[PDB]
Amino acid sequence: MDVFMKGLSKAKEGVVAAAEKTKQGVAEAAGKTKEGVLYVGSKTKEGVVHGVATVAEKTKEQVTNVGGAVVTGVTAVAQKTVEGAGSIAAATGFVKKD
Amino acid sequence: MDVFMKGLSKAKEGVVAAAEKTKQGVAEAAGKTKEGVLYVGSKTKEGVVHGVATVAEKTKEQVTNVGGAVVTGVTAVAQKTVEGAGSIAAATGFVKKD
Amino acid sequence: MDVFMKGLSKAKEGVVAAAEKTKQGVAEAAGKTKEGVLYVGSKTKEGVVHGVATVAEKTKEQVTNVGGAVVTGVTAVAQKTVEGAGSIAAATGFVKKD
Amino acid sequence: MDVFMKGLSKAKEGVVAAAEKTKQGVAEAAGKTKEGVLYVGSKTKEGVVHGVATVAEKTKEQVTNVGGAVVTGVTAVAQKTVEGAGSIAAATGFVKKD
Amino acid sequence: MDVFMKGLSKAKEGVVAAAEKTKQGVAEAAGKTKEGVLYVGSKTKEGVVHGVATVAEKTKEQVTNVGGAVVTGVTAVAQKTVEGAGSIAAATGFVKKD
Amino acid sequence: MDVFMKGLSKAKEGVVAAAEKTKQGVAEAAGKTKEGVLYVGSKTKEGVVHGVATVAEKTKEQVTNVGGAVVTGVTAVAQKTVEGAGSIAAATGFVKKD
Amino acid sequence: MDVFMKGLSKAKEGVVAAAEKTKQGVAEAAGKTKEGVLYVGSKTKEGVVHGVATVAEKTKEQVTNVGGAVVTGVTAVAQKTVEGAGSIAAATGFVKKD
Amino acid sequence: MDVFMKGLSKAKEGVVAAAEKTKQGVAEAAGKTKEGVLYVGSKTKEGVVHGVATVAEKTKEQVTNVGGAVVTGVTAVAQKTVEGAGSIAAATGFVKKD
Amino acid sequence: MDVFMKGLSKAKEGVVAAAEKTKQGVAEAAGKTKEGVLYVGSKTKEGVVHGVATVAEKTKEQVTNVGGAVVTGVTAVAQKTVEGAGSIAAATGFVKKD
Amino acid sequence: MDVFMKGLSKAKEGVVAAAEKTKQGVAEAAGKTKEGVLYVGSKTKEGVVHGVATVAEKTKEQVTNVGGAVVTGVTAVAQKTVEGAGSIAAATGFVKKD
Amino acid sequence: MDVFMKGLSKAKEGVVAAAEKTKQGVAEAAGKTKEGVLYVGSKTKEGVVHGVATVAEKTKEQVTNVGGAVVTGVTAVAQKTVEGAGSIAAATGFVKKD
Amino acid sequence: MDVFMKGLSKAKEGVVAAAEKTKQGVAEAAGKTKEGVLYVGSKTKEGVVHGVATVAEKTKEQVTNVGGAVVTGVTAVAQKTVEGAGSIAAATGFVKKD
Numbered sequence A, B, C, D, E, F, G, H, I, J, K, L: 001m002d003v004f005m006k007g008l009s010k011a012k013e014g015v016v017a018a019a020e021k022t023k024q025g026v027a028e029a030a031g032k033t034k035e036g037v038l039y040v041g042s043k044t045k046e047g048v049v050h051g052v053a054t055v056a057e058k059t060k061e062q063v064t065n066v067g068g069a070v071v072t073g074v075t076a077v078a079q080k081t082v083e084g085a086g087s088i089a090a091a092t093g094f095v096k097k098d
């Protein structure tokens, strides 16, 4: 079970170059992410919200937030004359300069 | 079971160049993502919202949010004279410069 | 079971160049995504909303949101003189410059 | 079962160049996506909304949203003098410059 | 079962160049998408809305939305002097420049 | 069962160039899409809306939306002096320049 | 691809009885047999005889045998008052004896 | 790919009875057999005889045998008052004796 | 890939009875057999005889045997008042004797 | 990949009875056998005979045997008043004797 | 990968009875056997005979045997008033004797 | 990877009875056997005979045996009034005798 590979796997005489993701000026809020996850015979239970109650009576204002991730604010990014955020990959092999 | 591969897998004499995603000026809010997920014989239960109640009586205002991810705000990005966020991949092999 | 591959798989003498996605000035809100997901004999249950109640009586205002992901706000992006977010892949092999 | 491949699969002497998607100035809201998903003998249940009730009585206003993803706001993108977001793939092989 | 392929599959001496989709100035709202999905012996149940009730009595206003994805807002894109978002693929092989 | 292929499949000595879709100034709302979907012995049930009730009595206004995807808003795109979003594919092989 | 079946296949309410071959007093010599063979995308090479030489000079006797199976002898069977070698299959269902 | 089955396959309410082969007084010599063989994407090479030489000179006798299976002898069977070698299969179901 | 099955496979409410082969008074010599063999992506090479030489000169007798299996002798069976070698299978289900 | 099964596989409410092979008075010599063999991505090389030489000169007798299995003798069986060698399988279920 | 099973596999409410092989009065010589063998990604090399030489000169007698298994003798079995060698399997379940 | 099982595997409410092989009056000589062998990513080399030489000159007699297993003798069995060698398996469950 060879699952996640970046290169030579049961191979011969390879020249591999692999880059990866970049981010420049990103503002995320309450996000989830799974990159390269492998379950084998497992049993999970993720991110549930259960049994929520909320009562109001003769009140003038009520603001409630329930969740896995609550974001109530400013998530700002400001850039100016920003230069260079990149993943470079170079590979060279089996050269015969004679 | 060879599942996720980037390169040579049971091969010979390869020249492979692989790049990857980029992001420049992205604003995400309450997003989910799964990249390269593999389940084998597993049993999961993800992201459920169950049994929510909300009562109001003679109240003047009631604002409620329930969820897996609640975002109530500003998620802003501002760029100016920003330059360069990219994934480059170069590969070279089996060259005979004589 | 060779599922996800980018390159040579049971091959010989290949020159492969693969790029990937780009994003420049993207604003997503409460989105889902699955890229390269493989289930084998698994059993899942994702993203359900069950048993929601909401009562109002003699109230002047009631604003409720229930869901897997609730976004109530501004998700803005502003760019100006932004240059370059791209994935490049170059491959070269089996050259005989004599 | 060779399912997703980008390159040489049980082949010989190939020169392959593959690009990928691009995005420039995109605003998505509450979207779903599946790219490269493979189920084998699995059993799923995704994105259901079940058993929702909503009562009003003598109230002056009631605004409710239930769903898998609720977006109530502004998802804007603004670009100006933005240049370059593209995936390039170049491949060259088996050249005999004599 | 060779399902999704981009290149040489059980072949010899190929020169393949494949591009991919582009997007420039796109505003999607509550859309679904499936690109490259393969089920084998699986059983699914996606996107159902079941058992919804809504009662009003002597109320002055009631606005309700139920669904798999509810979007109540502005999803706008504005571009000006934007240049270049395209996927290019070039391939060259078996050249004999003598 | 060779289902989806772009290139050489059980072939020899091919020069293939394939492009892909483009989008420039597109505004979609609550759309579905399936590109390259393959079911084998599977059983699905997608996008159903079942058992919806709605009662009004002596109320002054009631606006309800139920569905798989509800979009109640503005999905606008505005472009000006935008240039270039296209997928190009070039292939060249078996050239004998002597 | 349902290939070899003995019974109910995607059916309901069946009563099936299947017998099979018998042999009583059989003498086989250098025989081949294939019962229920299925090739899928395979490549075989069975039972070849290649490059055989035989030289004699001033010899008084030369007896040579080459082959996939050489039988030079007695393969005899003798029976007397032998009784019973048969495959019986009985099936009974959905009987309502009242 | 449901290949070899003896019974119910994706069925309901079946009564199946299957017998199998019998042998009584059998003498085989240098025989081959394949019952229920399935190749998928495999490559084999079975039972070859290659490059055989045989020289005689002034000899009085030469007896040679080459092959996959050489049998030079007696393979005899003798029976007398032998009784009973058979495969029986009985099945009974869904009987309502009232 | 459900390949070899004897009973219920993805079924309900079955009554299955399966017998199997019998042998009484059998004499085999240098035989091969394959029952229920499954290759997947494998590569084999079975039973070859290669490069055999045999020289005689002024000799009075030469007896040679080469092969995968050489049997030079007596393989005899003798029975007398032998009784009973059979495979029986009985199945009974869903009986309502009231 | 459910390959070899004898009973219920992904089923419900089954009554299965399976017997198996029998042997009474069997004499085998230099035989091969494979029952229930499964290769996955493997590479084998079984039973080869390679590079055999044999020289005689002025000799009076030469008897040589080369092979995977050489049997030069008596393989005899003698029975008298032998009784009973059989595989029986009985199954009973879901009986309601009232 | 559920390969070899005798009973219930991912099932419910089963009554299974399985017998197995028998032998009474068997004489085997230099036989091979494989029952329930599973290779995964393995590489083997079994039973080879390579580089055999044999020279005679002015000798009166020469008897040579080379192989994987050499049997030069008597392998005899003698029975008289022998009774009973069989595999029985009985199963009973879900009986309601009231 | 559930490979060899005799009973309930991921099941419920089973009544399983399994017997096994028997032997009565068996004489084996230089036999091999593999029952329930599983290789994973292994590499073996079993039972080879390599580089054998044998020279005779003016000798009166020469008897040589080379192999993996050499048996030169008597392997006899004699029975008389022998009774009973069998594997029995009985199972009973979920009985409601009221």
Ligand SMILES: Cc1cc2nc(/C=C/c3ccc(O)c(Br)c3)sc2cc1N(C)CCOCCF
Pocket (backbone or CB within 6 Å): A009, A010, A011, A012, B009, B010, B011, B012, C010, C011, C012, D009, D010, D011, D012, E010, E011, E012
């Ligand atoms: C596609 C292919 C692929 C291929 N791959 C080999 C060895 C790989 C290797 C060998 C050793 C290693 O260690 C590793 Br890693 C990897 S031969 C071969 C042949 C082919 N064809 C389609 C040839 C068809 O035409 C016949 C000749 F014209």
Ligand SMILES: Cc1cc2nc(/C=C/c3ccc(O)c(Br)c3)sc2cc1N(C)CCOCCF
Pocket (backbone or CB within 6 Å): A083, A084, A085, A086, B083, B084, B085, B086, B088, B090, C088, C090, C091, C092, D088, D090, D092
């Ligand atoms: C011509 C060219 C030009 C070029 N320019 C770049 C800017 C990078 C950067 C510049 C500034 C930054 O801040 C960052 Br981060 C990154 S990539 C690139 C690629 C290419 N090719 C297609 C060459 C083909 O290769 C031959 C293979 F055989």
Ligand SMILES: Cc1cc2nc(/C=C/c3ccc(O)c(Br)c3)sc2cc1N(C)CCOCCF
Pocket (backbone or CB within 6 Å): B083, B084, B085, B086, C083, C084, C085, C086, C088, D084, D088, D090, D091, D092, E088, E090, E092
């Ligand atoms: C002509 C060219 C020009 C070119 N220019 C780029 C800008 C990159 C960049 C520039 C500024 C940045 O900030 C960043 Br990030 C990235 S890619 C590119 C590719 C090409 N080709 C098609 C060459 C074909 O290759 C021959 C293969 F055989």
Ligand SMILES: Cc1cc2nc(/C=C/c3ccc(O)c(Br)c3)sc2cc1N(C)CCOCCF
Pocket (backbone or CB within 6 Å): A010, A011, B010, B011, C010, C011, D002, D010, D011, E001, E002, E010, G041, H041, J041
């Ligand atoms: C040409 C070819 C070449 C080829 N090469 C392999 C490497 C195996 C390996 C195995 C183990 C290792 O360690 C190494 Br290195 C390498 S499989 C294979 C298959 C093929 N075909 C023509 C399959 C066409 O039909 C497919 C049906 F879909």
Ligand SMILES: Cc1cc2nc(/C=C/c3ccc(O)c(Br)c3)sc2cc1N(C)CCOCCF
Pocket (backbone or CB within 6 Å): C083, C084, C085, C086, D083, D084, D085, D086, D088, D090, E084, E088, E090, E091, E092, F088, F090, F092
């Ligand atoms: C002529 C050309 C011109 C060209 N120009 C680009 C701009 C890139 C860029 C420029 C600025 C950026 O900021 C970024 Br990011 C990226 S791609 C490109 C491709 C081509 N071809 C079709 C060459 C064919 O290749 C021969 C294969 F055999």
Ligand SMILES: Cc1cc2nc(/C=C/c3ccc(O)c(Br)c3)sc2cc1N(C)CCOCCF
Pocket (backbone or CB within 6 Å): A005, B004, B005, B006, B035, B036, C004, C005, C006, C035, C036, D004, D005, D006, D035, D036, E004, E005, E006, E035, E036, E037, F004, F005, F006, F007, F036
């Ligand atoms: C082609 C394709 C290619 C493809 N490639 C992936 C990468 C996965 C990966 C993910 C993570 C990793 O680490 C690695 Br390595 C690899 S998904 C995918 C889906 C597809 N289709 C369904 C479209 C069919 O094309 C038509 C051809 F005619």
Ligand SMILES: Cc1cc2nc(/C=C/c3ccc(O)c(Br)c3)sc2cc1N(C)CCOCCF
Pocket (backbone or CB within 6 Å): B041, B042, B043, C041, C042, C043, D041, D042, D043, E041, E042, E043, F040, F041, F042, F043
């Ligand atoms: C495909 C399928 C799949 C399936 N999967 C189950 C249990 C999974 C599980 C249960 C528990 C677990 O822990 C795990 Br892991 C996994 S029942 C079932 C039924 C079916 N069908 C009837 C489909 C018939 O389509 C024919 C049209 F083509």
Ligand SMILES: Cc1cc2nc(/C=C/c3ccc(O)c(Br)c3)sc2cc1N(C)CCOCCF
Pocket (backbone or CB within 6 Å): A001, B001, B040, C001, C040, D001, E001, E040, F001, F040, G001, G002, H001, H040, I001, J001, J040, K001, L001
């Ligand atoms: C459908 C299929 C499915 C399939 N699944 C495998 C799993 C291997 C594995 C190998 C090792 C592991 O550890 C695991 Br987990 C799993 S091979 C395979 C082959 C096929 N076909 C040939 C179908 C072609 O016929 C369509 C006609 F309808």
Ligand SMILES: Cc1cc2nc(/C=C/c3ccc(O)c(Br)c3)sc2cc1N(C)CCOCCF
Pocket (backbone or CB within 6 Å): E010, G040, G041, G042, G043, H041, H042, H043, I041, I042, I043, J041, J042, J043, K041, K042, K043
């Ligand atoms: C089927 C096949 C299979 C195959 N397997 C190899 C190496 C295996 C290995 C090599 C080394 C190892 O260590 C191991 Br484990 C395993 S080459 C090869 C070639 C072929 N074909 C020609 C098939 C042509 O038809 C396809 C569609 F019809």
Ligand SMILES: Cc1cc2nc(/C=C/c3ccc(O)c(Br)c3)sc2cc1N(C)CCOCCF
Pocket (backbone or CB within 6 Å): G004, G005, G006, G036, H004, H005, H006, H035, H036, H037, I004, I005, I006, I035, I036, I037, J004, J005, J006, J035, J036, K004, K005, K006, K035, K036, L005
């Ligand atoms: C039917 C069958 C049944 C069968 N059963 C086996 C047991 C394996 C085992 C071996 C060891 C164990 O421990 C266990 Br549990 C289990 S091989 C085999 C082969 C076959 N065929 C090729 C004939 C196809 O039938 C026609 C139907 F229409």
Ligand SMILES: Cc1cc2nc(/C=C/c3ccc(O)c(Br)c3)sc2cc1N(C)CCOCCF
Pocket (backbone or CB within 6 Å): C041, E041, F041, H001, H002, H010, I002, I010, I011, J010, J011, K010, K011, L010, L011
């Ligand atoms: C009826 C049925 C029923 C069924 N039941 C399963 C158990 C899964 C399980 C999975 C994990 C566990 O832990 C347990 Br317990 C149990 S698969 C399955 C498939 C089917 N079909 C109709 C498939 C027909 O098409 C096949 C194409 F060939």
Ligand SMILES: Cc1cc2nc(/C=C/c3ccc(O)c(Br)c3)sc2cc1N(C)CCOCCF
Pocket (backbone or CB within 6 Å): G088, G090, H084, H088, H089, H090, H091, H092, I083, I084, I085, I086, I088, I090, J083, J084, J085, J086, K086
């Ligand atoms: C009538 C009968 C008689 C009968 N007699 C045997 C001898 C066994 C033996 C006797 C002596 C031995 O040494 C050995 Br080992 C074995 S099997 C047999 C089967 C049957 N039927 C067809 C009954 C049908 O079943 C109803 C299903 F619904």
Ligand SMILES: Cc1cc2nc(/C=C/c3ccc(O)c(Br)c3)sc2cc1N(C)CCOCCF
Pocket (backbone or CB within 6 Å): H088, H090, I084, I088, I090, I091, I092, J083, J084, J085, J086, J088, J090, K083, K084, K085, K086, L086
């Ligand atoms: C009637 C009968 C008789 C019978 N007799 C045997 C001898 C065994 C033995 C006798 C002596 C031995 O030494 C040895 Br070992 C073994 S099996 C047999 C089976 C049957 N049936 C077909 C009954 C049907 O079942 C109803 C299912 F619903």
Ligand SMILES: Cc1cc2nc(/C=C/c3ccc(O)c(Br)c3)sc2cc1N(C)CCOCCF
Pocket (backbone or CB within 6 Å): G010, G011, H009, H010, H011, H012, I009, I010, I011, I012, J010, J011, J012, K009, K010, K011, K012, L009, L010, L011, L012
């Ligand atoms: C075949 C089948 C199988 C099946 N298996 C279940 C639960 C198993 C289990 C449940 C829980 C466990 O813990 C274990 Br272990 C095992 S329901 C079910 C229904 C069916 N059918 C209706 C198929 C009808 O044929 C299709 C068309 F012909």
Ligand SMILES: Cc1cc2nc(/C=C/c3ccc(O)c(Br)c3)sc2cc1N(C)CCOCCF
Pocket (backbone or CB within 6 Å): I088, I090, J088, J090, J091, J092, K083, K084, K085, K086, K088, K090, L083, L084, L085, L086, L087
């Ligand atoms: C009738 C019968 C008779 C019978 N007799 C035997 C001799 C055993 C033995 C006798 C002596 C020994 O030395 C040895 Br070891 C072993 S098995 C057998 C089976 C049966 N049936 C078919 C009963 C059906 O069951 C109902 C299920 F629902």
